[PDB]
Design a protein around this nucleic acid. Structure first.
Ligand code: SF4
Ligand SMILES: [Zn+2]
Lengths: 134, 55, 320, 675
DNA sequence: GAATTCGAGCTCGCAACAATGAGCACAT
DNA sequence: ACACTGCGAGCTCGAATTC
């Protein structure tokens, strides 16, 4: 049972890892999807942990070896069409996503400059307190 | 270089199989010396064999 | 429902949450939004509202219209509160059901027999020179960092460390917390410490006879897990609130145990300290007055000379 | 006591039930009416056994057609005798409440070394010898000349059993192992074959795991017994390791040269069929050729079967009947002993396992040995990965199978490893009149130094001193017995020796004697009886041992034996062995279990089994420290079960060594006082 | 009526995570 | 084809007194 080509098949690379009825003949390696890791689904499409495992339907992942560790731990992989379908479900339209990213991408450079004034107001407080008194 | 790293693990297995053989001394009836030197010879059976592995 | 563990809060029988979780007026998290959608549509029975005296505020009284309940029990310890809003509470919850006779529970052994005492300290002549010069809020530092008040806390700590008593030194105005607890080398819960080292200071105080004192600052003004103090040397707390000085009293009764109240005399703090005993004299508590201690001038008390007393005025008045 | 579960009339043999134990029977009834499996967890050993047997024995009275037989799989023979003795206590309670007799019989099965009457065969020590000395006295060619009834060697108990022990069954009277020998003595029958014959007509049957989980055994004793039964897997926290070791053979050079001697002595007997000997002489050459390599470790689970047909040209179709014909060739040869041919059966069992079972298996040939670059002792492992290829007959044949222990650490790993779907998957927790356990995680040392038993934080003396400063300062406040499990033998030996070179072990010996558990059995049981005597008088002892040892799984520390149980680190397995590094590859693709989340699950079920060996009873109190920083994290302390996690607060979570004593001293003072 | 001081809580981003040892019960 | 549990940041309240 499929939906893209409608063929009857027992199992494929999909529908046992992501629950998607898609045959393994074409498989669309760079056509319909890619394999996006977990850390790219948090900083690009801006989803918290309450979006990948609590919003119905909860989507699952694939564990694999870490590329630059080889003895340490995991590397989770998600299906790319399942992420951008979830980002449209959590954040209204697609033209609300990047517009929310502009006010977020300025908050780190706001932290970059507000770190540099508390470093001024504290180091100048140590020398102004010695001259104000008498 | 493995031999000098294996000559130390025997050298305080001789002095950590003593503490159980002395731990039975502080209790009541002592252990027989033919059984405490049985596994100690078995632990020395590899260390003496590996002694000729890098002699 | 306290936003750290959240042990499946939807679909249960007893839910234990906080104020400003149920009446959080801003945009909620997604895990909290699903539980508040569940809690808003199920009728309860017997809500329990601990710390009832904070309900008549603007935010915490919106809780009683968010959640529907048949019965509403309110359990408190100190019903008094400034700004006259306890008469407001007679229709938010209900009529006053029972009030415990405080002198009767003491006479039956359910509450420790507290010997209240208000030792007041003379003002140093170098410090009273500046206390009457200015009126604009710098004089609050000048009566809480009094050098003669420092000698009455260092003496009262030593007098009960030699009796193996557990001392808690409640002190607001956090600059006076630092310059009291590092000149005696004692631990202090500063208030912006952590959750971690807040715990380990609180538990070496209980099960260890080596750490004897602890210098809290406006943290123990609620129903916290403070571990059974024996004395309580309150130094210059918040201004005229008789709610607070009945919550510091609850740390002592949890003469067996007895708490002090250090007051720099001939200042504004004398008017405050009789406005805070305005509630405790209505429970039969007798507040003695100690003018001179039991030999304060004969031990190794700090701030002995005048050159070490002149440096503190150059540190306190330098803040502004 | 006519206790009422939601549909039954359960006759309980006591007066006070615990409020958690009554809810155990409600969830146990919820499995049997749904005709499905169940993963339950309840801490104690007794009380759990008498409540499970109270419901199911009462369940087969109200519905005598839905369930008929109860199969109770316990770990080994001491718990087999314990369950039967709790069953007649319930049966005699039924004898007083009704005043009648019942058509109700209950047996217990074990090896031939336990049920044995004949004198020349009983005093044999090893278990694999008593089967052979039996088989020389009872085989079908030995009884072939007994049709003349002459003075040839024979067993009088077996030859009497088949003439009279068939028409009459066992009447009543729940039987132990010793009661079955007493019945076999005074009647003159075999105790072993009477238990095996009467196992088909019974109501409660108590044997070990290996009559049901082992595939080459369960088709001999439990194939036609019951299609509507109830299986209980008692104390089955390590149920997956039994399922792997049953279907995994291990071959080395020491075994293979003994198969050359068996193939030598078979060639002298055929001259006194022959194509089968050249078959095995071909196969023994290939397995020795694969062990002959000195190269990298390699894995090839169905590609072994291709190279076995390349140089040797043996297909896989006759290889499936390799172990079958060898069982038949020794029958027609009429060999006396069969323990001598044990390597050749082990090679023939290896041949019939690589031919059929290849989906989740592996073959690991390891020429480079453990830690040494050149020691001539290679070994090939035929290691099983998928632990659900041994319960797939058990999950299908029976009606309901209930996996119960006290330390099922997460309840969702067990239906993921084992491919089944339970209907309850419930947990429980004991209720107490006090708080009879005070767990604590003694983390950082007395000078704010981490305490962990990692691999890089083992040889520094800032951690070995903080282990020595802990066992010293807990041996002065704990009365009468401390069990200190280490993580290995080479770490226990390299820490007590490093406490002796410093001045720490002389200050522990002043308080308590210290006894060390060693690998050999004679010095261990000697050092275990002086431990249990030093806790009875006023001396007080310390039994410091390892975590995957004999004392941690067999010995049950009752009250005032081990008031404290000190875990000296998280008891991991060797995480870099080539067998385990291949099993986690199968556990990562199949079932998507993360490789870090399985080592912690395996370790928190051994660190909770031996810690949970300190409380057995209502009046038993017991300290249980966890002397490792790594226990404090969320993915490790959230795995230890819900009856030792509901008392682990957040104050007792990163305690230092000196603060861990004033929670130890305050708890032992509170517990010492009457109710 | 609109600031302060010091406290509280809930969201959420930030940065960087780990995993080392050793043996007897059960079938023809 | 990287990344778990802890933790200070804003945000918004509170009690009580101030400016
Ligand atoms: S046949 Fe019976 S008597 Fe003979 S060895 Fe077996 S169990 Fe013992
Ligand atoms: Zn398709």
């Amino acid at each position: 049972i499929c939906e893209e080509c409608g063929k009857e098949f027992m199992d494929s690379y999909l529908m046992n890892h992501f629950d998607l009825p898609t045959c393994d003949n074409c498989r669309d390696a760079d056509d319909k999807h890619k394999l996006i890791t977990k850390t790219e689904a948090k900083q690009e499409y801006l989803l918290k942990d309450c979006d990948l495992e609590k919003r119905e339907p909860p989507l699952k992942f694939i564990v694999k070896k870490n590329p630059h560790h080889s003895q340490w731990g995991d590397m989770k992989l998600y299906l790319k069409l399942q992420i951008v379908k979830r980002s449209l479900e959590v954040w209204g339209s697609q033209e609300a996503l990047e517009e929310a990213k502009e006010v977020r991408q300025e908050n780190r450079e706001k932290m970059k400059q507000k770190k540099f004034d508390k470093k001024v107001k504290e180091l100048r407080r140590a020398v102004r307190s010695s001259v104000w008194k008498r | 270089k493995e031999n000098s790293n294996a000559a130390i693990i025997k050298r305080f297995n001789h002095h950590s199989a003593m503490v159980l053989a002395a731990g039975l001394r502080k209790q009541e009836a002592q252990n027989e010396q033919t059984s405490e030197p049985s596994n100690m010879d078995g632990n020395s059976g590899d260390a003496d064999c590996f002694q000729p592995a890098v002699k | 429902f306290t936003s750290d563990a959240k042990d499946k809060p939807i679909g249960c029988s007893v839910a234990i949450s906080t104020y400003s979780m149920l009446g959080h007026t801003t945009k909620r998290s997604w895990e909290a939004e699903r539980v508040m959608e569940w809690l808003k549509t199920q009728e309860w029975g017997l809500m329990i509202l601990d710390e009832v005296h904070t309900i008549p505020a603007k935010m915490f009284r919106r809780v009683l219209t968010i959640v529907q309940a048949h019965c509403k029990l309110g359990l408190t310890a100190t019903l008094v509160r400034e700004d006259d809003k306890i008469v407001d509470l007679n229709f938010l919850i209900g009529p006053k059901l029972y009030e415990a006779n405080w002198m009767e529970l003491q006479n039956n052994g359910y509450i420790a027999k507290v010997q209240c005492a208000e030792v007041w300290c003379p003002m140093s002549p170098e410090f009273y020179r500046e206390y009457v010069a200015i009126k604009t809020k710098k004089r609050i530092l000048l009566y809480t960092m009094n050098p003669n008040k420092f000698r009455a806390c260092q003496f009262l700590i030593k007098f009960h460390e030699r009796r193996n008593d557990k001392i808690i030194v409640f002190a607001d105005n956090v600059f006076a917390l630092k310059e009291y607890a590092i000149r005696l080398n004692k631990p202090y819960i500063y208030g912006p410490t952590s959750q971690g080292e807040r715990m380990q200071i609180l538990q070496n105080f209980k099960h260890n006879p080596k750490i004897n004192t602890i210098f809290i600052s406006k943290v123990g003004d609620t129903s916290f897990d403070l571990p059974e103090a024996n004395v309580l040397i309150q130094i210059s707390s918040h201004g005229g609130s008789r709610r607070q000085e009945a919550q510091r009293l609850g740390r002592v009764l949890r003469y067996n145990a007895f708490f002090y109240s250090l007051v720099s005399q001939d200042t504004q703090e004398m008017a405050y300290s009789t406005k805070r005993q305005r509630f405790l004299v209505d429970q039969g508590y007798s507040f003695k007055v100690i003018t001179k201690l039991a030999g304060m001038e004969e031990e190794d008390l700090a701030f002995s000379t005048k050159e070490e007393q002149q440096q503190l005025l150059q540190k306190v008045l330098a803040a502004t | 006591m006519k206790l009422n579960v939601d549909g039954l009339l359960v006759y309980f043999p006591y007066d006070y039930i615990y409020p958690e134990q009554f809810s155990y029977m409600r969830e146990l009834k919820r499995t049997l009416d749904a005709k499905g499996h169940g993963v339950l967890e309840m801490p104690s050993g007794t009380g759990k056994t008498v409540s499970l047997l109270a419901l199911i024995m009462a369940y087969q009275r109200a519905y005598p057609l839905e369930v008929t037989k109860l199969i109770y799989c316990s770990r080994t023979v001491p718990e087999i005798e314990k369950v039967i003795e709790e069953l007649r206590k319930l049966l005699n309670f039924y004898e007083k409440q009704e005043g009648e007799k019942l058509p109700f019989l209950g047996l217990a099965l074990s090896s031939r070394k336990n049920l044995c009457i004949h004198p020349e065969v009983t005093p044999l020590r090893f278990g694999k010898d008593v089967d052979g000395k039996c088989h020389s006295l009872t085989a079908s060619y030995v009884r072939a000349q007994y049709q003349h009834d002459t003075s040839l060697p024979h067993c009088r108990f077996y030859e009497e059993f088949d003439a009279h022990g068939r028409e009459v069954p066992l009447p009543a009277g729940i039987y132990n192992l010793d009661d079955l020998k007493a019945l076999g003595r005074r009647q003159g029958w075999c105790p072993y074959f009477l238990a095996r014959y009467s196992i088909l007509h019974a109501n409660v049957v108590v044997y070990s795991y290996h009559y049901l989980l082992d595939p080459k055994i369960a088709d001999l004793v439990s194939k036609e017994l019951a299609r509507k039964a109830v299986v209980v897997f008692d104390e089955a926290h390590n149920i997956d390791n039994v399922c792997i070791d049953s279907m995994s053979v291990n071959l080395t050079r020491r075994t293979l040269d003994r198969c050359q001697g068996n193939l030598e002595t078979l060639q002298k007997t055929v001259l006194r069929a022959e194509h089968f000997l050249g078959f095995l002489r071909r196969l023994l050459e290939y397995v020795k050729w694969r062990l002959r390599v000195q190269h990298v470790v390699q894995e090839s689970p169905p590609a072994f079967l291709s190279g076995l047909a390349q140089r040797v040209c043996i297909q896989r179709k006759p290889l499936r009947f390799c172990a079958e014909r060898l069982r038949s060739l020794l029958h027609t040869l009429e060999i006396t002993d069969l323990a001598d041919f044990s390597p050749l059966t082990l090679l023939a069992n290896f041949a019939t396992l690589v031919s059929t079972y290849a989906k989740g298996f592996t073959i690991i040939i390891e020429p480079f040995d453990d830690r040494t670059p050149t020691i001539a002792n290679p070994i090939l492992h035929f290691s099983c990965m998928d632990a659900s290829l041994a319960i797939k007959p058990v999950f299908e044949r029976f009606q309901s199978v209930i996996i119960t222990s006290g330390t099922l650490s997460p309840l969702d790993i067990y239906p993921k490893i084992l491919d089944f779907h339970p209907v309850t998957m419930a947990t429980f927790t004991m209720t107490l009149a006090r708080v009879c356990l005070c767990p604590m995680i003694i983390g950082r040392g007395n000078d704010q130094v981490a305490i962990s038993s990692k691999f890089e934080t083992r040889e520094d003396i800032a951690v070995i001193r903080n282990y020595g400063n802990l066992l010293l300062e807990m041996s002065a406040v704990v009365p009468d017995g401390i069990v200190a499990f280490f993580t290995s033998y080479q770490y226990m030996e390299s820490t007590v020796a490093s406490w002796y070179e410093q001045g720490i072990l002389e200050n522990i010996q002043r308080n308590k004697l210290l006894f060390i558990e060693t690998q050999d059995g004679a010095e261990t049981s000697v050092a275990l009886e002086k431990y249990q005597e030093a806790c009875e008088n006023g001396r007080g002892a310390i039994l410091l041992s390892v975590a995957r040892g004999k004392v941690s799984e067999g010995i049950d520390f009752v009250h005032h034996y081990g008031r404290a149980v000190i875990m000296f680190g998280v008891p991991y397995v060797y995480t870099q062995s080539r067998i385990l590094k291949a099993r986690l590859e199968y556990l990562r693709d199949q079932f998507q279990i993360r490789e870090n989340d399985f080592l912690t699950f395996d370790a928190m079920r051994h660190a909770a089994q031996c810690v949970g060996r300190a409380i057995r009873g209502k009046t038993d109190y017991g300290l249980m420290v966890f002397a490792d920083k790594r226990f404090a994290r969320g993915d490790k302390r959230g795995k230890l079960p819900r009856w030792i996690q509901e008392h682990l607060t957040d104050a007792n979570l990163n305690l230092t060594v000196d603060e861990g004593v004033q929670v130890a001293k305050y708890f032992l003072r509170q517990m010492a006082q009457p109710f």
